[PDB]
From Swiss-Prot:
Ubiquitous. This is Cold-inducible RNA-binding protein. It comes from Homo sapiens. The keyword Repressor applies. Both the RRM domain and the arginine, glycine (RGG) rich domain are necessary for binding to the TXN 3'-untranslated region. Both the RRM domain and the arginine, glycine (RGG) rich domain (RGG repeats) are necessary for optimal recruitment into SGs upon cellular stress. The C-terminal domain containing RGG repeats is necessary for translational repression. The chain holds residues 3 to 85 of 172 of the full protein.
Amino acid sequence: SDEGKLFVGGLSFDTNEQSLEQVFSKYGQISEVVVVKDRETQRSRGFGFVTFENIDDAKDAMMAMNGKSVDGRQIRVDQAGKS
Ligand code: NI
């Protein structure tokens, strides 16, 4: 629902909020970054969300990062959908 929020998928098992912030901050100011984890075990589900303060920056980041390699894995970047 938030057009400034990007889904980032296909993460390596050890990719964390630090690597996402460093990568995506090139495109503008970031308000929230999260790697989604199992609640009980805290194991990464291999995707996350990056929210930009400015929606145009999210669009820029999607075009620039979708398909690019992070920690050896080609990531998928899309506007975050509902859920
Ligand atoms: Ni790694």
